Short mmCIF file of C-alpha atoms and ligand atoms in Angstrom, two decimals:
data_model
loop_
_atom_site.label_atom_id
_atom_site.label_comp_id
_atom_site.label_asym_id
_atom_site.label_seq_id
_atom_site.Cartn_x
_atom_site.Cartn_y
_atom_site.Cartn_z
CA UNK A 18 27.27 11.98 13.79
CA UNK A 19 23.76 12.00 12.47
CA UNK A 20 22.04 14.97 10.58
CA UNK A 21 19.28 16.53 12.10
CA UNK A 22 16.40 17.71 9.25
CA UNK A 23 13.50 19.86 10.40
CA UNK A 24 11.43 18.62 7.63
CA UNK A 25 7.95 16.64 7.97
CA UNK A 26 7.43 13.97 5.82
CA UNK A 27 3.61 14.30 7.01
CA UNK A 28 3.16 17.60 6.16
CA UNK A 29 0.78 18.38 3.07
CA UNK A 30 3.59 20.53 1.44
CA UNK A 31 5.76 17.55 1.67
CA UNK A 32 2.86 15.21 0.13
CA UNK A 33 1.85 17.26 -2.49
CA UNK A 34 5.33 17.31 -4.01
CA UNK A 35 8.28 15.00 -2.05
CA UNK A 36 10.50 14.30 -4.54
CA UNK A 37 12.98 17.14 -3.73
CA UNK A 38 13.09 16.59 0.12
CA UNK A 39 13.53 12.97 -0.29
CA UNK A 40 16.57 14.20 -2.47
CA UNK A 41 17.67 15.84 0.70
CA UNK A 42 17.06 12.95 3.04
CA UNK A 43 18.85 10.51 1.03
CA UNK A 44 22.11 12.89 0.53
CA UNK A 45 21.77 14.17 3.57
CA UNK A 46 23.26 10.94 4.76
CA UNK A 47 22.54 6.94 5.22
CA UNK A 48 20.59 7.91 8.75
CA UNK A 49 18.99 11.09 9.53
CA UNK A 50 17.56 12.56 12.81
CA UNK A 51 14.04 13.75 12.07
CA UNK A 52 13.66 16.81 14.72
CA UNK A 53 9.97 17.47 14.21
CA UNK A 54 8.73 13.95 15.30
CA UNK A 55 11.92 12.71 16.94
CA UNK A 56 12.48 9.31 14.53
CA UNK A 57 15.48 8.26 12.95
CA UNK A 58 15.19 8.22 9.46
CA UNK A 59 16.45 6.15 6.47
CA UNK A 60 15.51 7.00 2.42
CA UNK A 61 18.26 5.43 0.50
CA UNK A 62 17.51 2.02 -1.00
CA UNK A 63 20.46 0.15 0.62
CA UNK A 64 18.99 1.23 4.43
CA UNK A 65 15.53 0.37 3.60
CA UNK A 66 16.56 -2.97 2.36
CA UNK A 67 18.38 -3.46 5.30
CA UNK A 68 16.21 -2.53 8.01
CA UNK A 69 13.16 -4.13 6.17
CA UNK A 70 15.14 -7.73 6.29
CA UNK A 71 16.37 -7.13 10.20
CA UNK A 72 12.73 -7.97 12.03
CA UNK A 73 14.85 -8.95 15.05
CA UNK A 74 16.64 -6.01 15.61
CA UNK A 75 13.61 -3.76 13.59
CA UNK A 76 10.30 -4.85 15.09
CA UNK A 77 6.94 -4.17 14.25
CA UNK A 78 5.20 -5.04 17.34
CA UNK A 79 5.95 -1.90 18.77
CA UNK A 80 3.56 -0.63 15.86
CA UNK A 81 4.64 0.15 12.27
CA UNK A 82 3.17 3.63 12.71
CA UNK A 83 4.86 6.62 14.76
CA UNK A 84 2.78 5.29 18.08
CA UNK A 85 4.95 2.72 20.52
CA UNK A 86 2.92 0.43 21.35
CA UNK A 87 5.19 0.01 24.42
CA UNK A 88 3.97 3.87 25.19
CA UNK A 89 0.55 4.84 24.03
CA UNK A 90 -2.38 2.72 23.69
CA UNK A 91 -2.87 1.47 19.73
CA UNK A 92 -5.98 3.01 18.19
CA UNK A 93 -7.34 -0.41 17.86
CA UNK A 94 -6.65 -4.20 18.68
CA UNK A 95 -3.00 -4.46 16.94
CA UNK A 96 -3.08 -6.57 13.68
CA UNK A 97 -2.00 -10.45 14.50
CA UNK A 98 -0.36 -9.66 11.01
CA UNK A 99 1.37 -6.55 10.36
CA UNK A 100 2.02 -5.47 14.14
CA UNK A 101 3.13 -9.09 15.36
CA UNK A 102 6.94 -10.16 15.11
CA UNK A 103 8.03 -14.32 14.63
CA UNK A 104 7.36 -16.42 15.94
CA UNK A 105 3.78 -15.01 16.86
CA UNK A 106 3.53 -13.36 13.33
CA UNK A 107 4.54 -17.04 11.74
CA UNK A 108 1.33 -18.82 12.15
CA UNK A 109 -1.25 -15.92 10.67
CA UNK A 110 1.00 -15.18 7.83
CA UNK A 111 1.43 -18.78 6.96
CA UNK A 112 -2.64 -18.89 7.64
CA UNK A 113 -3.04 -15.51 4.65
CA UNK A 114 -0.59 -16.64 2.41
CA UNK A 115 -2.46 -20.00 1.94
CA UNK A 116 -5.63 -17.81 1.35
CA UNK A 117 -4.10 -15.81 -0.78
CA UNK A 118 -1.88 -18.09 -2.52
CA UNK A 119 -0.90 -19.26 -5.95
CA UNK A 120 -3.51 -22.26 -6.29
CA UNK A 121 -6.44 -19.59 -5.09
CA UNK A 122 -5.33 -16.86 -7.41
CA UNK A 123 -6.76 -19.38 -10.46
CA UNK A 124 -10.53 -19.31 -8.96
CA UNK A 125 -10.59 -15.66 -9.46
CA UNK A 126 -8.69 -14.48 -12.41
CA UNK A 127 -11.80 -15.05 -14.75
CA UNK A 128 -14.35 -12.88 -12.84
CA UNK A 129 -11.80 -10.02 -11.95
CA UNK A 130 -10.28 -10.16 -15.96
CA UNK A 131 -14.22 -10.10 -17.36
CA UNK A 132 -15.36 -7.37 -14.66
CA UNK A 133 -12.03 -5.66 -15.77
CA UNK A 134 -12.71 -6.03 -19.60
CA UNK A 135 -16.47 -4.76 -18.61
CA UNK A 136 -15.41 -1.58 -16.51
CA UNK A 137 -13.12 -0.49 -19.49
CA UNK A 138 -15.95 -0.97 -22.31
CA UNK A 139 -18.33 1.23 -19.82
CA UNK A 140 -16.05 3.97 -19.51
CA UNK A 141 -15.29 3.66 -23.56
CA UNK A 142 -18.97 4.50 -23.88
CA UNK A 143 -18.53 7.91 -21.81
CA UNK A 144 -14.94 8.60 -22.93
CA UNK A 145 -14.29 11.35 -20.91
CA UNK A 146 -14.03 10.11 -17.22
CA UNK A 147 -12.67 10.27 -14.14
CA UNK A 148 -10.04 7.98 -13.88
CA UNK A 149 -10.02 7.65 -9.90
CA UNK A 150 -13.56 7.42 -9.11
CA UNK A 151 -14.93 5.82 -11.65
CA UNK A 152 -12.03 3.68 -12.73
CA UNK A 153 -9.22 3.19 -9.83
CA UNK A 154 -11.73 3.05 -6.98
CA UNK A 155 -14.82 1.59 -9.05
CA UNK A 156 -12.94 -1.57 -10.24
CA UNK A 157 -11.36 -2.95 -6.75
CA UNK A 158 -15.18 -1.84 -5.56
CA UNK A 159 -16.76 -4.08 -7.90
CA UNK A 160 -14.30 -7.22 -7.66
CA UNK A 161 -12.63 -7.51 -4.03
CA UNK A 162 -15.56 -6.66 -1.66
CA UNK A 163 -17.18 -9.90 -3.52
CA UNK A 164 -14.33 -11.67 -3.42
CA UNK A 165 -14.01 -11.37 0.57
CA UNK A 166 -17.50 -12.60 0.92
CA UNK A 167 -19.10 -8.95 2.20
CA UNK A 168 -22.86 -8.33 1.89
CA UNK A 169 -23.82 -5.76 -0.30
CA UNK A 170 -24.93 -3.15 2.68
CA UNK A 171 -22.36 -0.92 4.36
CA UNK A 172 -20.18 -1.25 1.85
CA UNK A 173 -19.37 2.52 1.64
CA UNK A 174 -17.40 2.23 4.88
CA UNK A 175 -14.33 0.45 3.85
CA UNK A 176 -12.52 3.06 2.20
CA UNK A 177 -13.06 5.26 4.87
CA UNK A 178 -11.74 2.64 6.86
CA UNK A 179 -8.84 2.11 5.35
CA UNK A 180 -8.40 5.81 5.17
CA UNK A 181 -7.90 5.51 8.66
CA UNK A 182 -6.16 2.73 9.02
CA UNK A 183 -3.40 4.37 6.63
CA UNK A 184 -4.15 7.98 8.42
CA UNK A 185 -3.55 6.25 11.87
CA UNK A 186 0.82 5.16 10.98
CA UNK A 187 1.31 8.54 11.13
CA UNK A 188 2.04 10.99 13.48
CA UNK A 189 -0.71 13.02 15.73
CA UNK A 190 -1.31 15.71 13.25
CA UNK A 191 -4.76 16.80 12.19
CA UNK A 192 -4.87 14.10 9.61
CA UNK A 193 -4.71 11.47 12.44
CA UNK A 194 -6.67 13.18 14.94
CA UNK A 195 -9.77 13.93 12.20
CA UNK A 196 -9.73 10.37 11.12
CA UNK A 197 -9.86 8.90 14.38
CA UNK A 198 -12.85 11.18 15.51
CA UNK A 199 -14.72 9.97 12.64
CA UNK A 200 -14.02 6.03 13.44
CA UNK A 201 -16.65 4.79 14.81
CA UNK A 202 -19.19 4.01 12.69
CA UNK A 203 -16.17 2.41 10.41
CA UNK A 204 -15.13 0.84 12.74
CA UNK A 205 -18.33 -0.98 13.57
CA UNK A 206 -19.00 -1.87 10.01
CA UNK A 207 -15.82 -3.68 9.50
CA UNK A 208 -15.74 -5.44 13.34
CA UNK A 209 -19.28 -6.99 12.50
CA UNK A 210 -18.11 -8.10 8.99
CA UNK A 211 -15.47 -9.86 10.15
CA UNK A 212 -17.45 -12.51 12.14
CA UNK A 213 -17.84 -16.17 10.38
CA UNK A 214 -21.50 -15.82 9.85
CA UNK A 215 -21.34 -12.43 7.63
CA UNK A 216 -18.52 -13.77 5.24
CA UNK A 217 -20.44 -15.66 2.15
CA UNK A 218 -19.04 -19.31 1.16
CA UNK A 219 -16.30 -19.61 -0.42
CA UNK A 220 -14.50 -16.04 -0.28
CA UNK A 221 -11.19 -15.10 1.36
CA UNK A 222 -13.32 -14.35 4.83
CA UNK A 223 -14.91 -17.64 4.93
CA UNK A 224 -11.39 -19.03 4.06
CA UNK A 225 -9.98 -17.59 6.81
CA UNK A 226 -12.19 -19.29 9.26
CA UNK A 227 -11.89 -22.22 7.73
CA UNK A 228 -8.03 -22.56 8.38
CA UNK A 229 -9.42 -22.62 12.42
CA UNK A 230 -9.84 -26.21 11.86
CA UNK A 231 -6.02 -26.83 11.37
CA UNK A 232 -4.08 -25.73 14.38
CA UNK A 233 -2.93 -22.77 12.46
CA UNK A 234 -4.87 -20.14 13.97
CA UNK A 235 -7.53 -20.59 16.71
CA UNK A 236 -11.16 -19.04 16.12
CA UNK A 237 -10.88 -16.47 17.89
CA UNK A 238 -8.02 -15.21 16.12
CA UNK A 239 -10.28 -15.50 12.51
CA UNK A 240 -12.02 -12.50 12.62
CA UNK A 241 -8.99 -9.89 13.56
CA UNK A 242 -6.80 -11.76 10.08
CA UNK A 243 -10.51 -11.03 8.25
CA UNK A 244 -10.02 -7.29 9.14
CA UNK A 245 -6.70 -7.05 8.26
CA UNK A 246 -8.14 -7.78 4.52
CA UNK A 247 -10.53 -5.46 4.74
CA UNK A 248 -7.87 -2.89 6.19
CA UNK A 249 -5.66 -3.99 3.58
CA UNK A 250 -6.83 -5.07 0.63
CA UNK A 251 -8.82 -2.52 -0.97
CA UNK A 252 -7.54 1.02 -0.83
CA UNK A 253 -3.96 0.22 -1.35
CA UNK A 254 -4.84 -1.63 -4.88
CA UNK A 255 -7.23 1.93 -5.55
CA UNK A 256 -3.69 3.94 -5.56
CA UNK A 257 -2.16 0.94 -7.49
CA UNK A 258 -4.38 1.43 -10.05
CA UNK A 259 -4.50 5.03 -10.13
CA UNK A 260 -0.74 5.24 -9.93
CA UNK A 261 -0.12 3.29 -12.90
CA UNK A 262 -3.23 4.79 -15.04
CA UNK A 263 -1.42 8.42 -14.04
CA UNK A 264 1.52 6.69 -15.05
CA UNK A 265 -0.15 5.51 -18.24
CA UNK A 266 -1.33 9.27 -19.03
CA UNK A 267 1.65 11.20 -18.80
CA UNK A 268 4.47 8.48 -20.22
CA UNK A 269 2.41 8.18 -23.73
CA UNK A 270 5.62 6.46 -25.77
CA UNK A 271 4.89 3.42 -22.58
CA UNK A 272 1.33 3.42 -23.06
CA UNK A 273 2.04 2.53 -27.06
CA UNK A 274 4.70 0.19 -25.67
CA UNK A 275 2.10 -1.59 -23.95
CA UNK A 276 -0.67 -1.85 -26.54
CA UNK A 277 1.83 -3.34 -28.89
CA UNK A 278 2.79 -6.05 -26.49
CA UNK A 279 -0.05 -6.36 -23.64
CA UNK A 280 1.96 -9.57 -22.37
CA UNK A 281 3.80 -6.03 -20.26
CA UNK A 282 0.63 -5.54 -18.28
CA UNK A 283 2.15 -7.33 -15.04
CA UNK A 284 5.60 -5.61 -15.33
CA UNK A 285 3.81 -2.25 -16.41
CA UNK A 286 1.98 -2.32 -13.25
CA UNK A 287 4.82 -3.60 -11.03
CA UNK A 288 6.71 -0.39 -12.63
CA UNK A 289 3.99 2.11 -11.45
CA UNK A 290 3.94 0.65 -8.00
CA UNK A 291 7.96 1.02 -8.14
CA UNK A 292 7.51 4.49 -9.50
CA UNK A 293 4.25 6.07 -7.67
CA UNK A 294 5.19 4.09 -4.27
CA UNK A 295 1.42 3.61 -3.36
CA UNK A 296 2.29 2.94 0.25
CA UNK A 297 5.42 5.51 0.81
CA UNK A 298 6.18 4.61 4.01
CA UNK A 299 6.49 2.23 7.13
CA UNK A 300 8.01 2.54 10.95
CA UNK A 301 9.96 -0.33 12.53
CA UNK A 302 11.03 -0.10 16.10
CA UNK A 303 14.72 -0.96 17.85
CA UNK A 304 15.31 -3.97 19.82
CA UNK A 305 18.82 -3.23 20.67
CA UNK A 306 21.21 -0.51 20.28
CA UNK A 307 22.53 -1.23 16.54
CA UNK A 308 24.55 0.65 14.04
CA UNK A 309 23.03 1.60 10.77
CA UNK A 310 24.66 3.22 8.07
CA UNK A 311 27.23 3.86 10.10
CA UNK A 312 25.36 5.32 12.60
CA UNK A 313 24.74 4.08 15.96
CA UNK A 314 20.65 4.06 17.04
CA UNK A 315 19.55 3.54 20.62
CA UNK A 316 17.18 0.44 21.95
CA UNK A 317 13.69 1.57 21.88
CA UNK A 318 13.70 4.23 18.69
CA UNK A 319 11.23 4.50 16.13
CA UNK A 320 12.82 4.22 12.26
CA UNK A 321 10.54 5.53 9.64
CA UNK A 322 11.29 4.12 6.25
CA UNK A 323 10.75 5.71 2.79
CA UNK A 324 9.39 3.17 0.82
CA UNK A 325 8.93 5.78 -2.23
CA UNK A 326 12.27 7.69 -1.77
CA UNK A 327 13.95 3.97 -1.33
CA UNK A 328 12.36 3.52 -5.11
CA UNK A 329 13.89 5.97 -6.78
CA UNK A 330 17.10 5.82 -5.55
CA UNK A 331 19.91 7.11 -7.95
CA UNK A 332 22.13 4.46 -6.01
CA UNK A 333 20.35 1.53 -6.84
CA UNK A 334 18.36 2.39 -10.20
CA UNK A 335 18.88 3.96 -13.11
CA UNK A 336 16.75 6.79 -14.20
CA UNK A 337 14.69 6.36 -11.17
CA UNK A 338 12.42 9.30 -12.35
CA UNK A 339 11.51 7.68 -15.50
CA UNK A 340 8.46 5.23 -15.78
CA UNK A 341 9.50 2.25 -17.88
CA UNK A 342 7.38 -0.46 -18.71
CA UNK A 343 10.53 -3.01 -19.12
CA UNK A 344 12.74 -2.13 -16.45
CA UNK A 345 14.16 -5.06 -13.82
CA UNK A 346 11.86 -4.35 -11.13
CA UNK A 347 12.23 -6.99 -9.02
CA UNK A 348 14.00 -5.94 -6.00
CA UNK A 349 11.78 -2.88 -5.36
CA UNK A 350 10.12 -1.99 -1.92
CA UNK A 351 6.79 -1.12 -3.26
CA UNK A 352 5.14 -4.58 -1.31
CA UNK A 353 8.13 -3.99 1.36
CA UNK A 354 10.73 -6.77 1.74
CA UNK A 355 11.29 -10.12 3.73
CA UNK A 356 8.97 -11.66 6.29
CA UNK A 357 6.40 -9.31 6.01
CA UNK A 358 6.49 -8.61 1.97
CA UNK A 359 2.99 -8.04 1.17
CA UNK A 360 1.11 -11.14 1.68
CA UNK A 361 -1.75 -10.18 -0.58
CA UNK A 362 0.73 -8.87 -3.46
CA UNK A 363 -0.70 -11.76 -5.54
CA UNK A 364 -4.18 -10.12 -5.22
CA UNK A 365 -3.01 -6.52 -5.90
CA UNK A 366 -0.76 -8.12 -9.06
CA UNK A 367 -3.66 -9.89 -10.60
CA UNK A 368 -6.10 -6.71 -10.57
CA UNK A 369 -3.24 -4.48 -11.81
CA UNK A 370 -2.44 -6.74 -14.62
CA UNK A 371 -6.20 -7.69 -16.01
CA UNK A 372 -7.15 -3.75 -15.76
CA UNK A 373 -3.77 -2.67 -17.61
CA UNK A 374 -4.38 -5.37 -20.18
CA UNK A 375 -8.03 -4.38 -20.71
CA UNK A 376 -6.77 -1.02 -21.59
CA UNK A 377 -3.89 -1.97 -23.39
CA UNK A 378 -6.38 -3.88 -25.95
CA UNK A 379 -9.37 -1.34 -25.81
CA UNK A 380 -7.78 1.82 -25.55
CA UNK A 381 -5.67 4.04 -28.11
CA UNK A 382 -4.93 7.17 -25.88
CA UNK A 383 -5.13 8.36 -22.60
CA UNK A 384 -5.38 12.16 -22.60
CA UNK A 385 -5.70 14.48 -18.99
CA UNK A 386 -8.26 16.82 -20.21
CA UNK A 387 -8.98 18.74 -16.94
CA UNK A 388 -7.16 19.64 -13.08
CA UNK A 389 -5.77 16.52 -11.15
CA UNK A 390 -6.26 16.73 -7.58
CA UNK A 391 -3.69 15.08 -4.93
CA UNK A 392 -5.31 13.16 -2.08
CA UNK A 393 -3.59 13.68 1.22
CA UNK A 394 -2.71 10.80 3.92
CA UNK A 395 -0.15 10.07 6.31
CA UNK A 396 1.17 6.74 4.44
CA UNK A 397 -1.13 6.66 1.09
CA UNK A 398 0.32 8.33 -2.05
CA UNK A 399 -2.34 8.99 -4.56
CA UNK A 400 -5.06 11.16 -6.28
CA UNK A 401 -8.31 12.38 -5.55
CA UNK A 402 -9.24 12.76 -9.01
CA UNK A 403 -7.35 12.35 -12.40
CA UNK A 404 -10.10 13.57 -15.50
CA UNK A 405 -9.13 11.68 -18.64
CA UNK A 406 -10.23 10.93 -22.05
CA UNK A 407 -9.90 7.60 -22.92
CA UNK A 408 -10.11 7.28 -26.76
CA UNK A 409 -11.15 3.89 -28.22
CA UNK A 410 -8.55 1.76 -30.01
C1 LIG B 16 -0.67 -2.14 -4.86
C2 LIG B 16 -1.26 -2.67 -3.79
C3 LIG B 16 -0.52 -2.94 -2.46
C4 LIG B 16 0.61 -2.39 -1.99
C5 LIG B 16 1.48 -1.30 -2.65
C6 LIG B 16 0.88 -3.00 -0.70
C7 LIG B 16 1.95 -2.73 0.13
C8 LIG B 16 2.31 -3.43 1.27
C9 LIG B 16 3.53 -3.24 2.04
C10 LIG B 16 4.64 -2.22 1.73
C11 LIG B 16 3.51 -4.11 3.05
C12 LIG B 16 4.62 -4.29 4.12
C13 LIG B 16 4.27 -3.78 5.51
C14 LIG B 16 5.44 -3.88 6.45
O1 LIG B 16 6.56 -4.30 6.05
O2 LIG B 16 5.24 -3.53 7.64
C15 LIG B 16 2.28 -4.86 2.96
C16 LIG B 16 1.86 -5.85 3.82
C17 LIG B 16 0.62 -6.43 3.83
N1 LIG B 16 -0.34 -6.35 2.83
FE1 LIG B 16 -0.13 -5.32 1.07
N2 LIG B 16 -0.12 -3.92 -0.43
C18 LIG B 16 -1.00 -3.91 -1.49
C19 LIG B 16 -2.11 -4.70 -1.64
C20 LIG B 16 -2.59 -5.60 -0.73
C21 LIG B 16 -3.72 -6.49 -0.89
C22 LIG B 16 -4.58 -6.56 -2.17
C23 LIG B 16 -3.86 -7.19 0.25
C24 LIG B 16 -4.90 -8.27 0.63
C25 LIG B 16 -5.87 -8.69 -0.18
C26 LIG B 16 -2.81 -6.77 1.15
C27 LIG B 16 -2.61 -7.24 2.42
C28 LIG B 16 -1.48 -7.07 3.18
C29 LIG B 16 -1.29 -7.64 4.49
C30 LIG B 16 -2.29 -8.49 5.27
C31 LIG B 16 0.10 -7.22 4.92
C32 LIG B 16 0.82 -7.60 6.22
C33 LIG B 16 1.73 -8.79 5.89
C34 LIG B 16 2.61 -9.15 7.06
O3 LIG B 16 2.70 -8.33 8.02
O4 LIG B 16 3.22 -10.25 7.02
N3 LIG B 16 -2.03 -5.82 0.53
N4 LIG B 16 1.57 -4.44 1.85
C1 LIG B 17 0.01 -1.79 2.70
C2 LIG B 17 -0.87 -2.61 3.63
C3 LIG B 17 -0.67 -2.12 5.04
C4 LIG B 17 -1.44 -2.93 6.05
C5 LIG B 17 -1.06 -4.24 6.30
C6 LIG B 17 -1.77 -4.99 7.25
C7 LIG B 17 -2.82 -4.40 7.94
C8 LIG B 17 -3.57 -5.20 8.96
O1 LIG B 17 -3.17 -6.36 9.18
O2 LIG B 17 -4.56 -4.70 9.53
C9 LIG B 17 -3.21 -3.09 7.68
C10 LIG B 17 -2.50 -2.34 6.74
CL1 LIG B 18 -10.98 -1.28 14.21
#
């Protein structure tokens, strides 16, 4: 039989601290029975794996959030992406992975390495900065907005759009239910943006309409693959960032690890998105009755996933609760796992690397010098603030 927990993984006492209760979820069995939103749940590595690498029996067209699709109307158009199962999800993904791909990643490592180098010298020059505002957010801001091909104007709604977005996998609570009441003018923003004639030559929006020329996609499937850039692309590389510059300030032996070899920058990162778990967690739904762990799970069930827990499993890694710049990292679930692995983890890779390598040649120390604030969201894990001195190398 399955344990039944009473505790809320949404809940802001579970945000602002869950490594003890994902303790208890993993021990408390392969499969648990969450009571308070009626989900199965599954936070050991091995379970996460598995489900992640089922999309037959685990679908995501039901929605990846608590919602089933099958039951409640989605808050917006579902993703052709993210909420679309093969063969229908083949097609766009093949369609973002070519506009994101290897070959594309070379036309804009110069501009995001230089506006990296640049953002670090600035906040040398102040020293004493916040390192979410005006480093984790202010860098994606000034590099991936311009990379999609977005006008200047209205800029300032796509974090509150992705807010939302991220808000909106979770259950009804007040999170959810603020965010959506606020939508609209987000919403609108990003809708408009997405059409052909707002996306400047030669970014990943234009890009996207261009691949309506191929048979891959048709045009009127262009714009919604444009907003699932702009839903994910942006604030998920903000708690990147900020995850491994928090990581940076409190592990100061890794920090000296990295400025004595900055060819660590890519695995340094890929360790804070292990460690931090940026995006903690993601919902499948059953296609069939199937046993788990074990366990036996009904057709029609939602199974949330703990991304974060799933990362610091004792079972699968040792000293999960350490933050080590050299560790074998492949294999975590930080981008998720199989057919829907992130498709834009090259993106998120190259603007963790060139920012960790700009401060591990420009920067000596990394000292908190005043209160870090959490941020709370239903799937984001990340700060609100994080005041740091940076001291000059
Ligand atoms: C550190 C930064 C990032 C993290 C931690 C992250 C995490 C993830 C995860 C866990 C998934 C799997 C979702 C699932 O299995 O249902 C995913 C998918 C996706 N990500 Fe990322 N992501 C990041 C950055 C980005 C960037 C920069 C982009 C685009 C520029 C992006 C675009 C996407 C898209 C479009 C999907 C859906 C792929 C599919 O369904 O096949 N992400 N991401
Ligand atoms: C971690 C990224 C999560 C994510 C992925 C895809 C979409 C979308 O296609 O709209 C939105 C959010
Ligand atoms: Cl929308």
């Amino acid at each position: 039989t399955i344990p039944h927990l009473a505790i809320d993984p949404f809940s802001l006492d579970f945000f602002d601290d869950p490594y003890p209760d994902q303790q208890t979820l993993r021990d408390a069995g392969p499969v648990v029975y969450l009571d308070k939103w009626n989900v199965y749940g599954v936070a050991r590595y091995a379970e996460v794996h598995a489900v992640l690498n089922d999309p037959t029996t685990f679908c995501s067209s039901r929605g990846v959030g608590l919602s089933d699709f099958k039951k409640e109307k989605p808050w917006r158009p579902p993703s052709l992406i993210l909420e679309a199962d093969p063969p229908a999800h083949t097609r766009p993904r093949a369609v973002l992975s070519k506009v994101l791909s290897p070959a594309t990643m070379k036309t804009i490592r110069d501009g995001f390495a230089a506006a990296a180098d640049a953002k670090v010298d600035e906040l040398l020059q102040r020293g004493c900065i916040d390192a979410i505002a005006d480093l984790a957010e202010a860098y994606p801001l000034s590099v991936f907005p311009d990379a999609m091909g977005l006008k200047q104007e209205g800029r300032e709604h796509l974090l509150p759009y992705a807010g939302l977005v991220f808000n909106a996998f979770g259950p009804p609570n007040e999170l959810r239910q603020t965010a959506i009441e606020r939508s609209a003018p987000h919403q609108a923003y990003v809708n408009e943006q997405c059409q052909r004639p707002n996306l400047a030559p030669g970014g990943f929006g234009a890009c996207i309409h261009a691949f309506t020329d191929t048979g891959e996609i048709t045009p009127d499937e262009a714009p919604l693959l444009v907003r699932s850039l702009l839903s994910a692309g942006l604030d998920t590389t903000v708690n990147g960032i900020g995850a491994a510059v928090y990581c940076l300030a409190r592990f100061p032996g890794e920090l000296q690890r990295l400025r004595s070899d900055p060819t660590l920058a890519r695995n340094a990162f890929e360790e804070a998105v292990r460690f931090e778990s940026p995006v903690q967690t993601f919902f499948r739904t059953t296609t069939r009755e199937v046993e788990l762990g074990g366990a036996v799970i009904g057709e029609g069930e939602k199974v949330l996933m703990f991304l974060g827990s799933a990362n610091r499993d004792p079972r699968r890694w040792s000293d999960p609760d350490l933050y080590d710049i050299t560790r074998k990292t492949s294999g975590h679930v930080g981008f998720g796992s199989g057919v829907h692995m992130c498709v834009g983890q090259l993106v998120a890779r190259l603007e963790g690397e060139v920012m960790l390598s700009a401060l591990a040649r420009k920067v000596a120390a990394i000292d908190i010098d005043g209160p870090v604030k959490r941020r709370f969201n239903n799937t984001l894990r990340g700060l609100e603030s994080l005041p740091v001195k940076l001291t000059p190398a």
